[PDB]
Structure 1
Amino acid sequence: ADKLFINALKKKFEESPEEKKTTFYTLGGWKQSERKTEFVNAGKEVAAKRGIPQYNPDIGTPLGQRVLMPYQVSTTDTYVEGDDLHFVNNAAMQQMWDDIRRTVIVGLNHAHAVIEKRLGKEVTPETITHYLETVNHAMPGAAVVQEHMVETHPALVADSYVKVFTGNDEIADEIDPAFVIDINKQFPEDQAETLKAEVGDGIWQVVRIPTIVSRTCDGATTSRWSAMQIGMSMISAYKQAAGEAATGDFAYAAKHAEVIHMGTYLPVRRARGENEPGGVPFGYLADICQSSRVNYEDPVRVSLDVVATGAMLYDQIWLGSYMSGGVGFTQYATAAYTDNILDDFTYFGKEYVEDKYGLCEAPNNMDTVLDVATEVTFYGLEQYEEYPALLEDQFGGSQRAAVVAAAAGCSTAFATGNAQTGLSGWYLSMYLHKEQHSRLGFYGYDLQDQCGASNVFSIRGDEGLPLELRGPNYPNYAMNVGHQGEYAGISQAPHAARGDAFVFNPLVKIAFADDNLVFDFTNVRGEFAKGALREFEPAGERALITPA
């Protein structure tokens, strides 16, 4: 059959994808593009309205001396110019981040123990349901105790709410179902039994604060906002004095002793509080993506949907804005989720390992790393040499390094069932690619690449960690594009080949199995395409409180 990227290449260029020559300079520059023409026109309108020059195609060098390409969003039939995948221009990408930033997981286990021991009161499915009706009024910013309170407009905060989950089916049955993330409905039977065993009789809240508040403020607001309104709803639903010594134990539990933040705080050179992208470990990003519970008979689809989630968040929004900004890093990320290119390479690797070893059957050792990562690295590089249009599409070396090494690393982990040997395969792919083509990425691309082999199996203080615990603050990874989202995919890969329900934290996996989110985490690449087409409806807008 055709390689999986052939249809996209045939859409981009008039030539067949094998052809070695083309003609340039005759497309009229920016005038070849619908989207650049929209931007030229809008720049002139902006600059006149405000009295300061702004977008002008004649400043600097003239874009479009070659074809400005469409991109196919992988797994879709949607083709868009790359500007429609820039996070500023894509409301689905912005919403994906807002839905992670505004979520926290908050136990009720300590809180129910303070109620039974210090207060001497009962907790039952009934009192939990009453509490959940109360906190679903309070959480978006409405009052339950004081007179003369002024409140948030419910329709500005319609995306904020609180659900619960538990491994105990007979409570999950007894609590009103509007408030419950039902594990048995959301997960196939084997994954549901794993997840229920991990949670056991614990009961956990999934709290989503309003997108408009997250956008006004920051990620470190989320667990505070959540705990204020859990605290008011525990006082209202359980009949406390409205502010007694026991009220402090609910605050400490909701803010510190039973909270799970999506990201941990950062060191001062990159100072940020909790629930910012740099604090989200790679294992959590794979568990936030919900492809694992829908596409479980296809470990390549599950792993590549995690790569798309992480390349967009960590390279476009995090490295390309929070840690830099400007035009940013759209296409360093799009290489990992367009034109079915990473998909072709990773399906080759999966077939190679299923035929040679069987998934999860290969020895977990350096012999397996050398075999699989070298075979898949040579396959992916051969495609750029056989298809000139593929090399002109992924024109930057860094884009090619990340795609070829992601396929090599994921394939290695599909063989071993262990993410650490998949990570060693990622670094070996970089070293082979650098020698094959006498180039790799941009000036700084392989800082982590050259520390990489030596730090995969180190045990020292700031070196040693399983890949699932690493993230954008692991020291070697803290600066550079074209790695972080691919590492999230390698973290997912052995767990998708094993059939595991989660990669690192089962509470995080269950917390995003929820159709009341704005973004659909079961189909991340489909959502990116809907946002690119201007068809996604985000939360957070101010239209209701601004003129027509």
Structure 2
Amino acid sequence: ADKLFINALKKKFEESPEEKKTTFYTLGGWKQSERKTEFVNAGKEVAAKRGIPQYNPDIGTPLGQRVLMPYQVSTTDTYVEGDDLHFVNNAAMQQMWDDIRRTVIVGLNHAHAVIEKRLGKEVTPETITHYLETVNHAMPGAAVVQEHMVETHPALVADSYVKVFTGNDEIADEIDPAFVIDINKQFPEDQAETLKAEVGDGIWQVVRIPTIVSRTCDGATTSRWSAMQIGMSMISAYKQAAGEAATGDFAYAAKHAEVIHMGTYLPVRRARGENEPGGVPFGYLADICQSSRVNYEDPVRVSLDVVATGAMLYDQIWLGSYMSGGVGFTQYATAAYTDNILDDFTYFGKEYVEDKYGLCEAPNNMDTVLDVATEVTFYGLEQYEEYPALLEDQFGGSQRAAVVAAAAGCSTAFATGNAQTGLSGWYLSMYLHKEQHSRLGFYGYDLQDQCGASNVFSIRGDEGLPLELRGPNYPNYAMNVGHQGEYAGISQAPHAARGDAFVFNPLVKIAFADDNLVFDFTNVRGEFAKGALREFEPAGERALITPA
């Protein structure tokens, strides 16, 4: 019956969502808001304590001449003021990033070959389990060889550990299950078969370093820290000299030859090492999100969970802090994961496709792009025109451009089963939207949008790439809000419609299928809500080593 966003609009405003007029200016300004009132009071306290003015509602212009709205976290019944979705104020969002940043995947295949071929020693499921006991003591920062070592406090580093996975069920069954990511438990049968076949007899470690270290340091720490403690545990468990020539082979394997970073390093203007947000390709972000293994009968839900994951990380933390800062970009991102708005538009498109072509059954060509992206764009824009409350909700043109094009591009990919025609549909949506309303986004929103159509199918050096391989360092995408997380969703979309177990890297997909993570990647939007309510318990806090 109702569009999916109607309940949220009725919560925000006294008027029915269709009504065109309202009342302004008599709401009390900031005084209408519980959260702004909290902030006013805290600012006075802070300024007095430190002897320097801080938050003051009388500086600049007076917030709250209109309704300061609640937001529904999409797929939840949780309604919060938008400040509770700012990454600074939301521990769930900070932990989501920490859990990615502090992860690396490191093979044991080369390592086991060094042991067998260079050292002449045996590797068995028993020696692997012994090694895994050893590395789970050492990885958080504790000693195995030298006398008079000082160590990290176990409780400060409780979130760091090492697990393994392999496609060989019989071998997996022989390793203590405390250390194993069980692919057959975590994934539905057809997905498990695909993932096991991709891994084969390879054995891979998923290493998580301590959040407290990641926060003190940076993402490029992760693979170094991992390798040091892998190295020590190989010495201890396999009876090497503690520092012989073979020890260097384990180092080079763990740091270079068999490591999978979450993010690659960035060029000098935006200089950063590995495991920073800009290095994480869109296909990896889709695979980090675990919606695919729990919501696989609903491709829209899978795709929009990916969009939530990426809009928060890429717009709020990455573009809104690493690349800028200040108040930042909360609502540029919340547009993609609140009020069930993107959900309504994308369900529309999925239904359109299902009825016309069947999922994955449309021709992979421009005719399909023109059909589906145009239809879905016109639907979404019509909703802003029919529901003035919707338009006042997603008040910035950029937000609207992102949401409408995300639906258009995901729907096109649902039709073709191919992310590249989904991307073409995203750009067509932009062009149509711009002409319809004689506006699109902010001053710089459509840099990538105007380069977009020509670069979708280019094959040139710094232009051509399948969408799955693109990321925040693809040149056209390196600067602007309201695109990156949506592109992760479009990358996910054809794979979700196809029922594929992963989008770009099966190892990354399996690595986040782990109940010992702090953040729950199977329910990203639920976790955002939990953090907004101040109900999420992050790792990395220093309470144990500070005064009461």
TM bracket, shorter-chain basis: over 0.9
Per-residue deviation, 1:450? 0.1
1:334 maps to which residue?
A: 334
CA distance in 1, matches of 2:447, 2:130: 54
Deviations 1:318-365 (A, max 9, x none): 000000000000000000000000000000000000000000000000
Residue number in structure 2 paired with 1:518: 518
- Deviation, 1:452, is 0.1
User: What's 1:137 paired with?
Assistant: 137
Shift of 1:316: 0.1
Instruction: State the Cα deviation string for residues 185-225 of structure 1 (Å, max 9, x = none).
Output: 00000000000000000000000000000000000000000
**How big is the shift at 1:405?**
0.0
Q: CA deviation at 1:110?
A: 0.0
TM-score, structure 2 normalization:
1.00
Deviation for aligned residue 1:436: 0.1
Deviation at 1:424, TM superposition (A): 0.1
1:91 to partner: Cα distance: 0.1
Q: Secondary structure at the match of 2:63?
A: coil
Per-residue CA shift, 1:79-138, capped at 9, x if unaligned?
Answer: 000000000000000000000000000000000000000000000000000000000000
Rounded to whole Å, the distance in 1 between the matches of 2:294 and 2:368 is 30
* Displacement of 1:3: 0.1
2:118 is paired with a residue whose SS is: helix
Between the aligned partners of 1:476 and 1:356, the Cα distance in structure 2 is: 33
Deviation at 1:460, TM superposition (A): 0.1
Q: In structure 2, what is the Cα distance between the partners aligned to 1:543 and 1:431?
A: 52
Aligned residue number for residue 502 of structure 1: 502
SS of the residue corresponding to residue 403 of structure 2 reads helix
Distance 2:184 2:177 in 1: 12
Query: What is the correspondence of 1:296-307 to structure 2 with a 5 Å cutoff?
Result: 296-307=296-307
What's the counterpart of residue 170 of structure 2?
170
**Offset from partner CA, 1:482-521 (integer Å, 9 cap, x none):** 0000000000000000000000000000000001000000
Distance in 1, Cα, partners of 2:413 & 2:29? 44
- 3-state SS, counterpart of residue 22 of structure 1: coil
In 2, the alpha carbon distance for the partners of 1:185 and 1:363 equals 36
Q: Shift of the alpha carbon at 1:533?
A: 0.0
Secondary structure, in 3 states, of the residue corresponding to 1:540? coil
Structure 1 Cα separation of the partners of residues 33 and 325 of structure 2: 24
The superposition leaves residues 449-486 of structure 1 with CA deviations (integer Å, 9 ceiling, x where unpaired) of 00000000000000000000000000000000000000
Q: State the secondary structure of the residue aligned to 1:165.
A: strand
Distance 2:114 2:378 in 1: 60
Aligned residue pairs total 548
SS in 1 for 2:255: helix
Q: CA deviation at 1:438?
A: 0.1
What is the CA deviation profile of residues 347-402 of structure 1, one whole-angstrom value per residue up to 9, with x for unaligned ones? 00000000000000000000000000000000000000000000000000000000
Shift of 1:66: 0.0
Q: When the two structures are superposed, what TM-score results if normalisation uses the length of structure 1?
A: 1.00
Shift of 1:27: 0.4
**Counterpart-to-counterpart distance in 2, 1:56 and 1:254:** 51
Measured in 1, the distance between the counterparts of 2:351 and 2:243 equals 62
Distance 2:186 2:475 in 1: 37
Aligned to 2:380: 380
Q: Distance in 1 between matches of 2:193 and 2:542?
A: 43
How far 1:280 moved relative to its partner? Answer: 0.1
CA shift, 1:15, in A, is 0.2
Residue 316 of structure 1: aligned partner:
316
Q: Is the partner of 1:119 in helix, strand or coil? A: coil
In the TM superposition, what is the alpha-carbon distance from 1:174 to its structure 2 partner? 0.3
Offset of 1:317 from its aligned partner? 0.1
1:245 is displaced (CA, Å) by: 0.1
Cα distance between partner residues in 2 of 1:269 and 1:346: 36
Residue aligned with 1:159, SS: coil
Alpha-carbon shift at residue 78 of structure 1 (Å): 0.0
1:284-335 Cα distance to aligned partner (Å, 9 max, x none): 0000000000000000000000000000000000000000000000000000
Q: Hey, what's the Cα distance between the residues in 2 that align with 1:484 and 1:351?
A: 25
Aligned residue in 1 for 2:209: 209
Helix, strand or coil: the match of 1:284? helix
Give distance in 1, aligned partners of 2:65 and 2:474.
40
- What is the alpha-carbon distance in structure 2 between the residues aligned to residue 480 and residue 159 of structure 1? 33
Distance 2:354 2:115 in 1: 54
* Unmatched segments (≥5 aa) in structure 2: none
Q: Secondary structure at the match of 2:100?
A: helix
Alignment deviations for residues 244-291 of structure 1 (CA, whole Å, 9 cap, x no partner) = 000000000000000000000000000000000000000000000000
Percentage of identical aligned residues: 100
SS at match of 2:544: helix
Find the aligned partners of 1:245 and 1:117 in 2 and give their Cα distance. Answer: 14
Q: Deviations 1:16-72 (Å, cap 9, x if unpaired)? A: 000000000000000000000000000000000000000000000000000000000
> How far off its partner does 1:406 sit?
0.1
The residue aligned with 2:249 is 249
Q: Take 1:30 and 1:279, find their aligned partners in 2: how far apart are those partners?
A: 39
Give deviations 1:155-191, integer Å, cap 9, x for gaps: 0000000000000000110000000000000000000
Paired residue secondary structure (1:173): helix
In structure 1, what is the Cα distance between the partners aligned to 2:256 and 2:437? 51
Distance of 1:117 and 1:257 partners within structure 2: 17
The aligned counterpart of 1:347 is 347
Question: 1:429-459 CA distances to partner (integer Å, 9 max, x unpaired)?
Answer: 0000000000000000000000000000000
Alpha-carbon distance between aligned partners in 2 of 1:400 and 1:171, rounded to the nearest angstrom: 51
2:174 aligns to what SS in structure 1? coil
CA distance in 1: counterparts of 2:55 and 2:184, whole angstroms: 52
Provide the rounded CA distance (Å) in 2 between the counterparts of 1:539 and 1:159.
7
Q: CA deviation at 1:418?
A: 0.1
CA distance in 2, matches of 1:394, 1:253: 49
Counterpart in the other structure of 2:405: 405
How far has the Cα of 1:542 moved from its partner?
0.2
Residue equivalent to 2:69: 69
Structure 2 CA distance for aligned equivalents of residues 497 and 93 of structure 1: 28
